[PDB]
Amino acid sequence: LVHVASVEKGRSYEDFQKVYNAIALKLREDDEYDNYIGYGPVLVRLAWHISGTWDKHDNTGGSYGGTYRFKKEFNDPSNAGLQNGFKFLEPIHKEFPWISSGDLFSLGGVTAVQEMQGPKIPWRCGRVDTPEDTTPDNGRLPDADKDAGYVRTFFQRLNMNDREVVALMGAHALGKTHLKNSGYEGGGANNVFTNEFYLNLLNEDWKLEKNDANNEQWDSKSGYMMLPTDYSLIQDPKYLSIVKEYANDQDKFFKDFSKAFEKLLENGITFPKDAPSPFIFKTLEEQGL
Numbered sequence: 001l002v003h004v005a006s007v008e009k010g011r012s013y014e015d016f017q018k019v020y021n022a023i024a025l026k027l028r029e030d031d032e033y034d035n036y037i038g039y040g041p042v043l044v045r046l047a048w049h050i051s052g053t054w055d056k057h058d059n060t061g062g063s064y065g066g067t068y069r070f071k072k073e074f075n076d077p078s079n080a081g082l083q084n085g086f087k088f089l090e091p092i093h094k095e096f097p098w099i100s101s102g103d104l105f106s107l108g109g110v111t112a113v114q115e116m117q118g119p120k121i122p123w124r125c126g127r128v129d130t131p132e133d134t135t136p137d138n139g140r141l142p143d144a145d146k147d148a149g150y151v152r153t154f155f156q157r158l159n160m161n162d163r164e165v166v167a168l169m170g171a172h173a174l175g176k177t178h179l180k181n182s183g184y185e186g187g188g189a190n191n192v193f194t195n196e197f198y199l200n201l202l203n204e205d206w207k208l209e210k211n212d213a214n215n216e217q218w219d220s221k222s223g224y225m226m227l228p229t230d231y232s233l234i235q236d237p238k239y240l241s242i243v244k245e246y247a248n249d250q251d252k253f254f255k256d257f258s259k260a261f262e263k264l265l266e267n268g269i270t271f272p273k274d275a276p277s278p279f280i281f282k283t284l285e286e287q288g289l
């Protein structure tokens, strides 16, 4: 199965920068969401979930076809809560109806990371909507109650190695878990992208507790949390080495996250040799906007 990127007709960098700006301006405007966390974290989570259905073995799933717009996928129990990100992107889709759905969902994640002071994430256009029957079945996204070997095996399906897995998981410094969405509750409620996930893993005093949905999670005295899959990154000695690296080098972490997140968003896509190069959007702050 081949999905060839096809640039939205006649569009170039400046068209997509306008879309980025509209997302970024709405991020700034709709500040109250989730007790003033704002929409950044849920848009990162949405970009990852729409990409994380990919299966390298047959090229099913993935961001290309924009299939999250179909009920089977937006109703996946693994996607509970992401409807808030979809609703946030709806007026953007209405203003720019030419951008494909996969391009919009993935650009939402890029814009959120950058506007939250994260790394620049190069982004390529050309995902093309595919029909409802191309929507992947539920059950391709990962469980949180599992250990390091589960995480490692899970991410082989996405063609990610240990460093890429540990880098991507640093997004769990953003936002929070919500009991009604996932059966987990807690988190830093942060909307600034940093390497704090790794520092918190190494430096907090963690206790394994049950939450009010009767699931186990790691809680710290200072009010942070880790899922069992997060904490597994310090139980496995190979992951632990990388956690220590990122806790000790914010620039390294930013560079490695940027590469892994672009790769995640592009898995499954064949780009023509004469496709445009990846775009690097300016933030609102770099534009004086």
Ligand code: HEM
Pocket: 041, 042, 044, 045, 048, 080, 081, 142, 143, 144, 145, 151, 168, 169, 171, 172, 174, 175, 176, 177, 178, 179, 181, 182, 183, 184, 227, 229, 261
């Ligand atoms: C083993 C892998 C992973 C598991 C099991 C996992 C699980 C979860 C769970 C259970 C939640 C809480 C959902 C809710 O209650 O609202 C969550 C939130 C989140 N996840 Fe992950 N996740 C994983 C990997 C990732 C990756 C790779 C990224 C992106 C790079 C990501 C980004 C996020 C973000 C940003 C949030 C916060 C959302 C918000 O505040 O609304 N996650 N994740």
